[PDB]
Write a protein that binds this DNA or RNA. Structure first.
Length: 1125
RNA sequence: GACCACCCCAAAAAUGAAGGGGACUAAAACACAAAUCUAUCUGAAUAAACUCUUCUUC
RNA sequence: GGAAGAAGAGUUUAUUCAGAUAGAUUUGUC
């Protein structure tokens, strides 16, 4: 296989004139340039040792011969065989003597090995190998030329259609219409029947079925016989070409040669005549045999030739294969009319759909869907915050609605923000709101509150409405516009409150204190630091910068290596020493990421000058002297290092930074810090400081208004953070959502914007990313005190074979006191999160019917094993030292390994138990569900787009067709009311009232069946509206069953559903096996934990532990099959 | 009957449709393969600091 | 509105192992 793109940054892009290979993002045509490159013969190609069979000594001999010839090639620049070298070669190698390849070529190959002679005439051996390459490269350059933009828009002065000009597409248009679909299918079947006959096919399948390595030539050899290659080539090929010259028409050609094989005459029509003559029903038939052939060859190419073991019978049996190729050419045809719709929207009348235009749609749409997770997981929390009792969606109704009724002219409707009071839930919602947002809500002063919830709602919607329903003109950058929301007082103040200069500084102050910086540094020395260095709440990855902790770890050893100019902290007390070291690591950690990186990556750079010191010492103890910039350089260093193998790359890069950082410290006057611990005199002064500072901090966080003491302010005043976020309205509303977000949806949201920024050189989202990095700091952590109730906890407990409803029984259950201390419940982070996002009633049900509960026997194991995890962790810690960084003589005795194995195994058990006990396993499940759900909406998104695609493609004329997808029903003449589904059915029913025989399946009797079962279209409503919650009328397995039915129009989509589900489980740590029946109803056969590979590079057996407990895997299984009742 | 895709282009001589391409289209946006590095968050452990709760004993 | 001993939870910080997302480079593609 020749890889002609993605090497050299070349890509094939399509342009109106022609299709060309392009480089970078320039439009210059580099086809000839790149191909001319590949017309070389790589000399190893000549020798190989694939199998187990060879003796090692011989096998080593040949492996050797491989690497040597891998850097020499043969080309013909101008009728002369010639040689080239890829790379430098060792000046001296003892070649010695060392029937290895096909015989003819040997003479020159040995001489080449020993350097002996040009023997240019003797390079003619390889002439025939090249003219074959040259013919491949040639046929290719044409396969590139003919792949070109072929979709065009005609205004028509009236009509405004889009159509394709590919020869392929000229045949789609003919059958573009629904009416012609049945003829298009027969023509296919004619063609399949002409080429392929049951006896011969029945016998191919035997051969494919009976496959022996490289007996595949048997199948190829057989296929050519079926296709009569020998007849066409031997008999008709030359006559056809020359005669092709003699006549203009296909018709005129046929008269000249009337005994032309059917396939060889379809192939002819396609290349020469299809493009340019009127198509008649007689003419079009010619095109089909070529189309069906390609589909089989494509099947053979994909299945027999390259790659599952006996499924092949499924697609290759005569009766199946026939249907397969029919559906296929239908699927290909249906996606062409959809493409006509799509381009009809985006193209001015002149235009053609070039690769530049096409490419940006996929990228834009795809990004936008990632943001589907954000709105969905945020809605669900907004549902949690106010304990609504709507089976139905609550989007868009936080506020009371007063209407003119059919009678009496005025009436007022429930405001979900207005049930808060009607239902006497003010207390529960107050505490619920506080958990997400830190503000002292007044649940009187209702207007303030109603105006606030209406912020979270409208915020989430501004997103949801854009992504869930295809929006033609939505662009990536604007998803977080939050266009019509105007923040309310409660939101304005809180965002001002949280992103406050003082509060932010008090967070760096708190860090500094807990690092023991305030108890081991004099006030004046600190102020010198603060006037000098800035703080960032999170670091960024400059590309090549090694981790500080890795760097710090290696300080003592290197100074022996290089004149470090440092002294480690040492002291009488070990306990102080660790404390002091943290202070040193925290202060230093701060300069590196920040002040130094700026200087070191800086043009006014230490880095080039230092870098040679590392180089020079290494020579004393060969890396490049090419100037440029540090990231490219170091990159270049990577390449040299890799190519040799013989680790040493990390040291150079580690060594550059350590000496770079120190000399930086000494040079720019931070050096005093070595003596941070040092003097007992001063420390006694500072002994009460860390304690006293901590006492305040709680005081200030609890109050947030406390007068600040003078001693603290001196410090607060000289801290510098770098730029504070400007207040933005958009930022404030973005802030409201971020807090609603779950912990994984934040991490995924963040990686999504960073992808957008990396992908296109736009820093847009720069502000929004800053906020996340601030909030992501403690979003999961338990910010404030919260309360859970035993009856809520109880739901997952087996007390004497019953759930616990009572604070009093909770005592009987908890002999060991993990849940209850006897007056208040224990408040683990895990509990904290379950309250926020727990959908405990549903969770309660699923667990209940999966036999998941927590038992006393399990509690008594957790406490027993809790007593010994310190050891097992200390064990793992030290042992990993031995593996990773080992002493001069140390070995991993197998006993070391068994000891390790046992430790990690004891830890997984404790962890697995601990997670169940603490309700983390339930939190994991909660999120897995919301992800599966919200991922599914994304599918509804395509379908809702594909529909209006094929519509405008099918019926450009119909003005009304767009009405179906516009939710602004004032604006619609027809299909005035409803949802996309309902408007389409009305459209569909009218579309064929007149029918050969009654078309309509959407009868009122039938539609009623559909709506209840969530079958056909109606599944899209179940999915997009999140109706699965909270009842689970239908199963996830069922949903998947008819979501796929719903996407059966596009193959690629229909069989991507289960990939997105298998892959979403792997993220969460489950490996799933499903079975899909002849009935096509999904079931789960197994669910099991993904594994962790420990000690990845030991000659010993793979050691691993499961990611999730079998009890949990058993609970994800039932979740999927969980139906109501 | 998916996980185990899909669409486009190559047929005289170059019947090797035994070939190539695709952020172009799905996989919720940058070919896979392999190996490093890093940012962020999360789980499990330990140490120091502060805060709150529970228990036992005179 | 009494002392003195056990405990636990939360938060901050340094460190060890692991995962998930995302970013950077290298190597190579019968």
């Amino acid at each position: 296989s020749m890889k002609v793109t993605k090497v050299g940054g070349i890509s094939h892009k399509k342009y109106t004139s022609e299709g060309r290979l392009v480089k970078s993002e320039s439009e210059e045509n580099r086809t000839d340039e790149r191909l001319s490159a590949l017309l070389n013969m790589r000399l190893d190609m000549y020798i190989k040792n694939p199998s187990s069979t060879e003796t090692k000594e011989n096998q080593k001999r040949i492996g050797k011969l491989k690497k040597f010839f891998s850097n020499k090639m043969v080309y013909l620049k101008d009728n002369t065989l010639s040689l080239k070298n890829g790379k430098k070669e060792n000046i001296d190698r003892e070649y010695s003597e060392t029937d290895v390849r096909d015989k003819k070529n040997f003479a020159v190959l040995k001489k080449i090995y020993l350097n002996e002679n040009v023997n240019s005439e003797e390079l003619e051996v390889f002439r025939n190998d090249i003219k074959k390459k040259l013919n491949k490269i040639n046929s290719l350059k044409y396969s590139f030329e003919k792949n070109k933009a072929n979709y065009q828009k005609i205004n028509e002065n009236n009509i405004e259609k889009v159509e394709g000009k590919s020869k392929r597409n000229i045949i789609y248009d003919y059958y573009r219409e629904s009416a012609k679909r049945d003829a298009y299918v027969s023509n296919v079947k004619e063609a399949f029947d002409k080429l392929y006959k049951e006896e011969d096919i029945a016998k191919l399948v035997l051969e494919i079925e009976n496959l022996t390595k490289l007996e595949k030539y048997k199948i190829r050899e057989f296929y050519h016989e079926i296709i009569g290659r020998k007849n066409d080539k031997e008999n008709f090929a030359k006559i056809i070409y020359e005669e092709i010259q003699n006549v203009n028409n296909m018709k005129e050609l046929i008269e000249k040669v009337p005994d032309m094989s059917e396939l060889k005459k379809s192939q002819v029509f396609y290349k020469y005549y299809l493009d340019k003559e009127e198509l008649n029903d007689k003419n079009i038939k010619y095109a089909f045999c070529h189309f069906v052939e390609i589909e089989m060859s494509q099947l053979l190419k994909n299945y027999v030739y390259k790659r599952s073991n006996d499924k092949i019978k499924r697609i290759f049996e005569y009766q199946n294969l026939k249907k397969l190729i029919e559906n296929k050419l239908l699927n290909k045809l249906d996606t062409y009319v959809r493409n006509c719709g799509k381009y009809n929207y985006y193209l001015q009348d002149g235009e053609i759909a070039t690769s530049d235009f096409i490419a940006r749609n996929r990228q834009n749409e795809a990004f936008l869907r990632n943001i589907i997770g954000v709105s969905s997981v945020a809605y669900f929390s907004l549902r949690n915050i106010l304990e609504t009792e709507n089976e139905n969606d609550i989007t868009g109704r936080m506020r009371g609605k007063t209407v003119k009724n059919n009678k009496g002219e005025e009436k007022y409707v429930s405001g979900e923000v207005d049930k808060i009071y009607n239902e006497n839930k003010k207390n529960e919602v107050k505490e619920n709101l506080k958990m997400f947002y830190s503000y002292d809500f007044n649940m009187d002063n209702k207007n303030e509150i109603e105006d606030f919830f209406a912020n979270i709602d409208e915020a989430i919607s501004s997103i949801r409405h854009g992504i869930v329903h295809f929006n033609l003109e939505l662009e990536g950058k604007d998803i977080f516009a939050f266009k019509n929301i105007a923040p309310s007082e409660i939101s304005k103040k809180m965002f001002q409150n949280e992103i406050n200069e003082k509060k932010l500084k008090l967070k760096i102050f708190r860090q500094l204190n807990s690092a023991n910086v305030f108890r081991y540094l004099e006030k004046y020395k600190i102020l010198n630091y603060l006037k000098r260095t800035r703080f960032e709440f999170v670091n960024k990855n400059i590309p090549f910068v090694p981790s500080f902790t890795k760097l710090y770890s290696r300080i003592d050893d290197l100074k022996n290596s290089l004149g470090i100019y440092w002294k480690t902290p040492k002291t009488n007390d070990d306990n102080k020493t660790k404390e002091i070291i943290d202070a040193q690591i925290y202060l230093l950690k701060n300069i590196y990421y920040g002040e130094f990186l700026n200087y070191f990556m800086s043009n006014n750079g230490n880095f080039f000058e230092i870098s040679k010191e590392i180089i020079e010492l290494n020579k004393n103890d060969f890396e490049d002297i090419q100037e440029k910039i540090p990231k490219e350089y170091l990159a270049n260093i990577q390449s040299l290092y890799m190519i040799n193998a013989g680790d040493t790359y990390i040291d150079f890069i580690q060594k550059i930074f350590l000496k770079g950082f120190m000399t930086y410290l000494a040079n720019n006057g931070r050096l005093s810090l070595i003596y941070i611990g040092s003097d007992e005199e001063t420390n006694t002064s500072l002994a009460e400081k860390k304690q006293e500072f901590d006492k305040f901090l709680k005081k200030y966080e609890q109050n947030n208004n406390i007068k600040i003491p003078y001693e603290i302010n001196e410090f607060l005043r000289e801290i510098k953070l770098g730029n504070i976020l400007k207040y933005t309205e958009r930022l404030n509303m973005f802030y409201l959502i971020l807090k609603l977000l779950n912990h994984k949806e934040l991490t995924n949201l963040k990686g999504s914007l960073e992808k957008y920024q990396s992908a296109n050189k736009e820093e847009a989202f720069s502000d929004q990313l800053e906020l996340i990095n601030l909030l992501n700091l403690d979003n999961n952590r338990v910010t404030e005190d919260f309360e859970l109730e035993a009856d809520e906890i109880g739901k997952f407990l087996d007390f004497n074979g019953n759930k616990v409803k009572d604070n009093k029984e909770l005592k009987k259950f908890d002999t060991n006191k993990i849940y209850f201390d006897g007056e208040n419940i224990i408040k683990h982070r895990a509990f904290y999160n379950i309250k926020k996002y727990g959908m405990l009633n549903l969770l309660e049900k699923i667990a209940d019917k999966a036999g998941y509960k927590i038992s006393i026997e399990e509690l008594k194991k957790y406490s027993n094993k809790k007593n010994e995890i310190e050891k097992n962790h200390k064990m793992q810690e030290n042992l990993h030292r031995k593996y990773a960084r080992p002493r001069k003589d140390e070995k991993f005795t197998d006993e070391d390994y068994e000891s390790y194995k046992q430790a990690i195994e004891n830890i997984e058990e404790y962890t697995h138990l601990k997670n169940k006990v603490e309700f983390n396993e339930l939190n994991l499940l909660q999120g897995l569900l919301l992800r599966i759900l919200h991922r599914l909406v994304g599918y509804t998104s395509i379908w809702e787009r594909d529909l209006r695609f094929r519509l405008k493609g099918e019926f450009p004329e119909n003005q009304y067709i767009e009405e179906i997808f516009n939710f602004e029903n004032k604006k619609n003449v027809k299909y005035k009311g409803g949802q996309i589904v309902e408007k389409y059915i009305k459209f569909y029913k009218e579309l064929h009232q007149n029918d050969e025989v009654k078309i309509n399946k959407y009868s009122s009797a039938n539609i009623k069946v559909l709506k209840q079962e969530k079958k056909d279209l109606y599944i899209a409503n179940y999915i997009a509206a999140f109706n699965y919650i909270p009842h689970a009328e239908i199963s996830l397995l069922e949903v998947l069953e008819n979501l796929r039915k719903l996407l059966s129009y596009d193959r690629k989509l229909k069989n991507a559903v289960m990939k997105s589900v298998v892959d979403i489980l792997k993220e969460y740590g489950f490996v799933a096996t499903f079975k899909i029946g002849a009935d096509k109803k999904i079931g789960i056969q197994t669910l099991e934990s993904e594994k962790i590979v420990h000690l990845k590079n030991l000659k010993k057996k793979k050691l691993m532990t499961d990611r999730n407990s079998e009890e949990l895997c058993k609970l994800v299984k039932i979740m999927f099959e969980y139906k109501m009742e």
